[PDB]
Design a protein around this ligand. Structure first.
Ligand SMILES: [Zn+2]
Ligand SMILES: [Zn+2]
Ligand SMILES: [Zn+2]
Lengths: 290, 146, 118, 317, 55, 667, 121
RNA sequence: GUAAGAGCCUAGCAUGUAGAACUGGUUACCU
């Protein structure tokens, strides 16, 4: 079936740095790069030296996977789909073979058009449970180097007869002997062998993380960067969440606080919650083992 | 009736696709709230206004995409509970009295079987037809001989 | 095999007007042209619903029944020859009044088989 | 004895009209009691004078068996459907077909006119109903969701605007605007081949060989269950005096109270002379607009006309 | 140009529309090529109308 | 959604009937039945319809009675459909409307099947309801025939003798008549081949064949099955019977021998009309001048009427009792020959699925059925006329007289019946009534059939071909006399033997009010108008007319005006319709040769009657243009004219089609 | 006889349910553990909680395999003598002739006698 | 003895895409 819905579903690094946008709407302009059914193509210009970006996928194929219709990144975080499904589960299993894909698309289109039109129909309940490593490498400010005109292929042959007037960039393309160069549309969309997402996962795996209690039943927590401006009365008020708290040794000379819990499970849970995240009184509290 | 007439017009628009070929410039405005705020995004703003013009259609341009592609019927909506009665008990006698015998035809033998002759000629109606003579042939024959 | 019955028919809902008008096809037949593009309505003498609302139908029906029954009532030498008058009282024997629900024994079929087989 | 029913007078035959050369599969009465239509298996629609029982007109044009015939109350029209797959519109001003409604895949079994919008709703063997605009001859919607053939359809102006029983034993109450199902009533064990709407009380009944069931309209609430008439019933019709009529394929026809559901009369009528004892059967019945005649369309290729007995009470249970 | 773009979109390289709108096969056709390249009254009406106008 | 147009109609009917039965058996089964078994019941429905078309009684020994009743119901529905479609298509093929050739063959195949259903019904009802003949009446018929044969000193036909000197001539004549059948064609199956092989053996060794024929005539009384099919003449259907070759050779010799010994013995009096020395137009001419040569036939001064009656013996073939036929043939021939001829009519008739036994009527397709028909017709001529008037017409046996002649003037005017011919099963009687006889006979009719409302003038058919001055006028005396004469001739025949029907007959009265009597004979109708009656302009220029002279005075008294009957015109039109069918209809010389044969058949039969009929000339022009348009469409040629007519009308030796014209065409 | 797919179910159920023997130790253990909620109504709470130990599911699977085997023995194969004069040219033809002898064998018994005695009487 | 599977062989008609994620760490008491 056709798609035909007003006003596309876009992020903020593609919708532009100007709050005043003029876009055009073509009713059944292109076919979807995934669904292969025709949809409503919106064409806008973000800024001044930009590229006139347009939506690449259906409203439906963005409702399935909670993405922007042109950068194909998560609307909330701004990350590839393989990274977000790595920091979640993968239970969608959208078919890739032909007849199965059109059949699944038909049935999910009936599912979405038999509902409200507001939620990521399958990704919602798993989208509740979040804030994994993806939040610690989520991009803070927009990468406006995406919205940028392609390399002038006449300037690559040293024959750009437009010169100063050509709206395409006169700068180096990337060396093709690079994993970060191939990048199919469907590889970026299904979450399969995406090299950008591979590098983000390789960075987020070597992100500093918890170590286990090397010796048995030790719940002792070694707090460095405690600080002499905070109080121990607030420490218990943050720490009675976990369970039966045992003794808390405080040494304000080395800024180290020693913590004992009932079970080692509670110390591991505290390690999960506390490490490289917890900032109380606007001051970072570092916790270690040993 | 107001809901039906709109769908009627959208169906009937095919019957004359180009008679006074169409016109499109209601250039409109829409106010949009990015739900992404945390500002480095608009430039520091909370909303953005977008002017939508509809792209002007070429009169002389054929349909763009293949529409004849054909896919099997999807699943029906989830089954309703069946709400029947307890169910009348069935007897061996009535279960056997509703049995249907196989048709042995005088004409068709689709899978080319070989049927025993008594089975093949079990046309009882031409065996119970009982050609029965009248008793007024006797008066005729006797009167003619006399 | 090739020669086979149906035992299941085709289900409507998957073509040309069925779900999205076959995704809005630009194909249309000659029979799908504009024709009879104005509904006629019943006029005041025809049987307009205002005229049919106040009426008492049973009295008029009884009057028409009475008139029809009244119409049906008011409507209604060689003496030495070896055979005498065989047709004495045969006043044509009203077979052409009977209607018989059997296509081999209708009077129409008897006239048909008499007429078209020599 | 939980209720006491209203007393209804017995009905009796007084006229047997003959002249179709096929099973008479449908019947409908004109809004002004001047005539009635029948449609039959001999591919003719016959206009009969209602008072005198005389053949007024014979219209031809269907290629196969005429299954449903309805007369428009707003427009001077006559709608018919057949096993032809065809849905026709007859201009009675001219006695000629002016419009055909094309799109059903197999035999069209029924039709009903919407009482206020100029919308025609048909059923077919292709497990769908369709919703046609009369003026533009276009399918507005395709009511799909039954799994076997669809037997009957009724229309309203109030809520659920379209109601249909089918041969997959279910009943679907639909939305005319959206085109999707609102209520599925699975209570019947065999094929629902008749539904009938009440003129005042905002209920409907439906019939199948197991038993007949009454129902409140908004969400199909169960109200009652009327049993005793156990044959494949083809039609149900209601008198404004609360007389339900249930006729069946064995030729039997039982006359019921609507409110309490009391069987007060069983009429097992005799066949035509040439006819066969296995050929007794009713396919259609209608009340006239005076609601004092009962027109039945029989399987022995006849029309039977009944009226109330003027010999008062001989009755009461 | 319209008529032979219709010819070349249907991959009927064995037909030739000359400059006076006569449609002739370049070679001798198989049965499958002959059934593929049968046109209807629309194509031939437009072709003969264009023949009259070119005259 | 494909439409059910014309080639999908029967398939869609069978597609929908089967679905209706599917729905009914899903709703008919009770609550706990295994919900299989739909396919088996549908097979039983197919079998019940094939037994319906086969006229086989269909009964499955165990089968639940709701299933059996439902299958009988839907089979009756399909039977009504099949039969009403056959009625509609037959009325189309009769009226000339546009029909496919396939629906012509389909309609023939339905009609022969419906005929055999009715015929099995009729044979069963004969064996059930006794004879119709009512033994008193059969003794009356037999005794009348005995008194007639002893009155004429008839010498009964012996068995064909062992040293019959003429029998090889009869064998050569029989074999020539059998080999004239397979002369036109060249595509022959096994049975035709066997037939020609037996013919060649009978030529090559005649005495072995004669010994075999006489041995079959002595011994054989049980015979093989005969096939039946119909010839489609587009106005009616004709039964055609297929007999085994050996039996056919025996019947052919029996036919030749019986007609030879009947002519020597003068069995058939000269009113048995398809005679060897009289073509049918010569028969009409002889009948006209026989009316002219009656004494004072045209005088109406003292009140006299001339009545002409034309009718048939309606079901004469269909109602011959075979036991009574055995009795009458044992009166005529040897008892062995009579038993052979009787037992030969009792055969089994086959068409594809259908078999029954001819227990009552006679097979028209026998070689010697001609003799049975003319002799049973002689018996009923004796019934109509009576033995006295028939003995006056035939004359004495020592000096018998020819066709329309008496011995004396006094024996002409003895009775009202003056002339009488029977052409095979059609009757033609001429009546001369004096006023007293007419009054008495109308008194008897109005006694037996009173008419207070003067309704006798309503149902009286008059001929509409002739113009308004030319037809029979409708006067009360003449109308009642015509109906009374018909009544009196009708009473003379038992309805169990044959009957005479008013709707097929035409009566014509000539009186002081009627200046014309119309009659209809072999296929052209004619009216005779005398000069003493209202002519007023004694003319002789036209060629359609006949100036027929009185014999005695050698002067021309009356005129005879001829036209072609509408049935013969319609038969020619149907013949041309048959030519335009028949899929060898592209050959361009086959078409023209069939047209030329049909055209000279028409013309050389109806020679001078053709130009006096304008409707037949217009039909000839239209049919000629039809076959020319068929040739032109064979060249496709276009709608536009100036197709050169030299290609049609050139003689076939210069390369032309050889086409004969009967229309006003100019080059 | 058969009469119903539910009566055969009920017969099969009565067989299986007479065959089973409970162990009271696990029963009274679960009774003392669960207490008040061991006699539940329709709406109790415990629908989504029970986790069967390996021996329980092993007992279930063994019982179900026995049930499948007893069901697989439902049509016992009648032995194939080859002394009967065969009447079929195929393997499906034989079974169709067997069904035909089931249904029409009671009626076509005189004609069989005629065919064996020499098409007589 | 067909101009179609199959099945091979060589071919050429549509695209002008989306995308490029890259930085932080201290040690200490009584027997
Ligand atoms: Zn998409
Ligand atoms: Zn984006
Ligand atoms: Zn450049």
């Amino acid at each position: 079936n056709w798609e035909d819905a007003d006003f596309p579903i876009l992020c903020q690094t593609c919708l532009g740095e100007n709050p005043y946008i003029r876009m055009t709407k073509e009713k059944y302009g292109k076919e979807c790069k995934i669904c292969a059914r025709p949809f409503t193509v919106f064409r806008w210009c973000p800024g001044v030296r930009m590229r006139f970006k347009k939506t690449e996928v259906c409203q439906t194929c963005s409702k399935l996977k909670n993405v922007c219709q042109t950068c194909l990144l998560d609307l909330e975080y701004g990350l590839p789909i393989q990274v977000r499904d790595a920091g979640l589960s993968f239970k969608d299993d959208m078919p890739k073979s032909d007849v199965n894909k059109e059949y699944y698309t038909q049935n999910m289109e009936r599912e979405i058009s038999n509902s409200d039109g507001t939620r990521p129909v399958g990704m919602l309940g798993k989208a509740t449970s979040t804030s994994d490593m993806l939040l610690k490498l989520a991009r803070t400010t927009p990468y406006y180097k995406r919205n940028r005109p392609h390399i002038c292929s006449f300037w690559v042959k040293g024959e750009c007869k437009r010169g100063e007037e050509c709206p395409y960039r006169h700068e180096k393309p990337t060396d093709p002997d690079d994993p970060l160069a191939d990048q199919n549309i469907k590889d970026r969309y299904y979450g399969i062998n995406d090299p950008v997402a591979d590098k983000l996962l390789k960075r987020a795996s070597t992100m500093p993380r918890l170590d286990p209690p090397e010796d048995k039943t030790i719940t002792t927590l070694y707090v460095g960067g405690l600080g002499d401006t905070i109080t121990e009365t607030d420490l218990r008020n943050h720490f009675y969440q976990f369970g039966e708290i045992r003794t808390i040794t405080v040494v304000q000379r080395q800024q180290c606080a020693f913590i004992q819990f009932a079970t080692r499970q509670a110390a591991e849970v505290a390690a999960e919650k506390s490490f490289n995240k917890l900032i109380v009184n606007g001051r970072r509290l570092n916790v270690k083992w040993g | 009736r107001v809901a039906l007439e709109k769908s009627v017009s959208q169906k009937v628009a095919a019957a004359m696709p180009v008679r006074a070929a169409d016109k499109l410039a209601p250039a409109q405005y829409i106010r949009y709230t990015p739900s992404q705020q945390g500002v480095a995004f608009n430039s520091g703003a909370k909303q953005r206004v977008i002017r939508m013009v509809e792209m002007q259609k070429d009169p002389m341009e054929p349909p763009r995409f293949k529409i004849n592609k054909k896919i099997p019927r999807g699943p029906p909506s989830p089954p309703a509970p069946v709400m029947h009665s307890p169910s009348r008990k069935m007897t061996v006698k009535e279960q056997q009295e509703w049995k249907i015998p196989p048709c042995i035809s005088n004409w068709k033998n689709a899978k080319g079987y070989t049927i025993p002759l008594d089975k093949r000629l079990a046309a009882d109606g031409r065996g119970l037809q009982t050609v029965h003579i009248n008793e007024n042939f006797a008066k005729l024959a006797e009167a003619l001989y006399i | 095999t090739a020669a086979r019955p149906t035992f299941e028919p085709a289900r409507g809902g998957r073509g040309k007007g069925e779900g999205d008008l076959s995704q809005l096809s630009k194909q249309y037949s000659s029979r799908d042209l504009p024709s009879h593009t104005k509904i006629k309505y019943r006029q005041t003498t025809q049987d307009a619903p205002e005229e049919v609302r106040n009426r008492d139908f049973r009295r008029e029906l009884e009057e028409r029944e009475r008139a029809a029954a009244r119409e049906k009532n008011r409507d209604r030498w060689d003496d030495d020859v070896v055979f005498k008058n065989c047709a004495k009282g045969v006043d044509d024997q009203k077979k052409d009044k009977r209607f018989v629900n059997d296509t081999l024994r209708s009077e129409f079929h008897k006239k048909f088989m008499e007429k078209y087989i020599k | 004895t939980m209720p006491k029913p209203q007393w209804h007078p017995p009905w009796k035959l007084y006229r047997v009209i003959s002249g179709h050369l096929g099973w008479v599969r449908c019947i409908a009465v004109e809004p002004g009691n001047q005539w009635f239509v029948t449609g039959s298996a001999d591919r003719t629609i016959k206009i009969w004078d209602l008072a005198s029982g005389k053949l007024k007109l014979s219209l031809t044009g269907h290629i196969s068996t005429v299954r449903g015939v309805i007369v428009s109350t707003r427009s001077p029209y006559l709608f018919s459907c057949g096993e032809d797959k065809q849905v026709k519109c007859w201009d009675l001003e001219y006695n000629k077909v002016i419009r055909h409604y094309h799109g059903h895949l197999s035999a069209v079994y029924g039709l009903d006119l919407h009482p206020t919008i100029d919308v025609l709703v048909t059923c077919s063997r292709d497990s769908t109903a369709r919703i046609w605009d009369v003026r533009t001859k276009a399918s507005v919607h395709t009511l799909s969701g039954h799994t076997n053939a669809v037997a009957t359809v009724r229309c309203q102006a109030a809520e659920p605007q379209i109601i249909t029983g089918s041969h997959d034993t279910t009943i679907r109450l639909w939305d005319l605007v959206a085109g999707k199902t609102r209520v599925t009533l699975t209570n019947h064990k065999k094929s629902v081949r008749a539904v009938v709407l009440h003129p005042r009380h905002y209920t409907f009944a439906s019939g199948s060989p197991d038993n007949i069931k009454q129902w409140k309209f908004p969400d199909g609430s169960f109200i009652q269950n009327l049993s005793g008439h156990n044959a494949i019933i083809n039609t149900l019709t209601v008198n404004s005096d609360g007389v339900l009529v249930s006729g069946a394929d064995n030729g039997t026809m039982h006359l019921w109270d609507w409110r309490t559901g009391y069987n007060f009369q069983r009429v097992h009528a005799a066949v035509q002379p040439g006819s066969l004892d296995s050929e007794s059967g009713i396919f259609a019945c209608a009340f006239d607009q005076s609601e004092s005649r009962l027109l039945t369309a029989e399987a022995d290729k006849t029309i039977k006309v009944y009226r109330e007995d003027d010999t008062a009470t001989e009755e009461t249970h | 140009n319209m008529l032979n773009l219709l010819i070349h979109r249907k991959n009927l390289n064995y037909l030739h529309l000359d400059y006076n709108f006569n449609l002739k096969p370049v070679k001798t056709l198989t049965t499958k090529e002959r059934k593929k390249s049968r046109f209807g009254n629309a194509f031939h009406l437009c072709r003969e109308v264009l023949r009259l106008t070119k005259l | 959604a494909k439409t059910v147009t014309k080639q999908r109609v029967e398939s869609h009917f069978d597609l929908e009937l089967r679905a209706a039965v599917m729905h009914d058996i899903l709703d008919m089964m009770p609550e706990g039945i295994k919900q299989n078994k739909a396919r088996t019941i549908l097979q039983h429905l197919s079998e019940a319809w094939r037994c319906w078309k086969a006229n086989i009684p269909w009964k499955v020994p165990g089968l639940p009675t709701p299933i059996e009743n439902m299958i009988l119901r839907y089979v009756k529905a399909k039977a009504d459909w099949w039969t009403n479609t056959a009625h509609y298509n037959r009325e189309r093929i009769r009226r000339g409307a546009t029909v496919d050739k396939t629906v012509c063959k389909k309609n023939l195949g339905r009609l022969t099947r419906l005929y055999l259903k009715a015929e099995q019904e009729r044979q069963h009802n004969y064996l059930k309801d006794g004879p119709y003949i009512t033994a008193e009446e059969a003794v009356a018929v037999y005794t009348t025939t005995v008194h007639w044969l002893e009155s004429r000193r008839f010498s009964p036909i012996p068995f064909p003798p062992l040293s019959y000197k003429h029998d090889t001539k009869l064998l050569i004549l029989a074999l020539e008549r059998l080999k004239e059948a397979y002369s036109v064609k060249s595509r022959l199956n096994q049975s035709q081949r066997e037939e020609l092989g037996l013919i060649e053996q009978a030529y090559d060794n005649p005495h072995e064949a004669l010994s075999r024929i006489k041995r079959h005539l002595l011994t054989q009384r049980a015979f093989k099955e005969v096939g039946i099919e119909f010839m489609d003449l587009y106005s009616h259907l004709v039964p055609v019977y297929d007999v085994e070759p050996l039996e056919k050779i025996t019947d052919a010799y029996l036919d030749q021998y019986l007609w030879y010994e009947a002519d020597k013995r003068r069995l058939f009096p000269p009113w048995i009309k398809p005679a060897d020395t009289e073509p049918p137009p010569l028969l009409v001419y002889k009948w006209c001048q026989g009316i002219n040569n009656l004494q004072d036939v045209w005088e109406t001064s003292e009140g006299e009427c001339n009545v002409m009656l034309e009718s048939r013996f309606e079901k004469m073939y269909e109602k011959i009792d075979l036991t009574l036929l055995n009795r009458l043939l044992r009166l005529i021939v040897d008892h062995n020959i009579a038993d052979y001829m009787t037992a030969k009519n009792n055969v089994v008739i086959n068409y594809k699925d259908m078999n029954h036994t001819n227990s009552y009527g006679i097979i028209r397709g026998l070689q010697f059925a001609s003799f049975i028909v003319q002799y049973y017709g002689l018996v009923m001529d004796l019934l109509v006329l009576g033995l006295h008037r028939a003995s006056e017409m035939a004359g004495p046996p020592q000096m018998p007289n020819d066709f329309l002649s008496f011995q004396d003037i006094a024996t002409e005017a003895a009775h009202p019946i003056r002339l009488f011919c029977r052409y095979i099963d059609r009757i033609h009687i001429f009546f001369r009534f004096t006023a007293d006889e007419a009054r008495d006979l109308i008194q008897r009719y109005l006694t037996e059939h009173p008419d207070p409302n003067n309704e006798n003038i309503v149902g009286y058919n008059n001929k509409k071909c002739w113009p308004r001055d030319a037809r029979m006028r409708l006067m009360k005396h003449d109308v009642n006399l015509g109906r009374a004469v018909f009544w009196d001739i009708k009473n003379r025949l038992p309805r169990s033997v044959t009957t005479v029907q008013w709707e097929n007959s035409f009566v014509s009265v000539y009186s002081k009010d009627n200046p014309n009597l119309l009659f209809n004979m072999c296929g052209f109708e004619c009216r005779i108008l005398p000069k003493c009656r209202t002519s007023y302009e004694e003319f002789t220029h036209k060629d359609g007319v006949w100036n027929l002279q009185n014999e005695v005075t050698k002067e021309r008294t009356a005129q005879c005006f001829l036209r072609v009957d509408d049935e013969s015109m319609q038969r020619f039109h149907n013949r041309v319709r048959q030519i335009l069918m028949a899929s060898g209809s592209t050959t361009f010389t086959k078409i023209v040769n069939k047209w030329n044969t049909a055209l000279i058949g028409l013309m050389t039969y109806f020679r001078e009657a053709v130009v006096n009929t304008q409707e037949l000339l217009d039909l000839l022009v239209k049919c000629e243009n039809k076959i020319q348009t068929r040739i032109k469409i064979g060249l496709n040629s276009k709608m536009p004219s100036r197709f050169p007519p030299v290609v049609f009308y050139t003689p076939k030796e210069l390369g032309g089609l050889g086409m004969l014209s009967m229309g006003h065409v100019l080059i | 006889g058969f009469s119903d797919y539910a009566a055969a179910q009920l017969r099969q159920y009565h067989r299986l349910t007479k065959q089973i023997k409970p162990d009271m130790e696990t029963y009274e253990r679960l009774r003392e553990k669960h207490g008040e909620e061991f006699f539940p109504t329709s709406n109790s709470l415990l629908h989504g909680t029970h986790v069967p130990s390996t021996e329980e599911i092993d007992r279930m699977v063994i019982d179900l395999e026995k049930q499948i085997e007893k069901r697989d023995k439902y049509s016992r194969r009648r032995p194939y003598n080859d002394d009967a004069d065969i009447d079929y040219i195929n393997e499906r033809n034989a079974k169709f002739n067997k069904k035909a002898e089931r249904f029409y064998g009671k009626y076509t018994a005189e004609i069989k006698q005629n065919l064996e005695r020499g098409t007589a009487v």
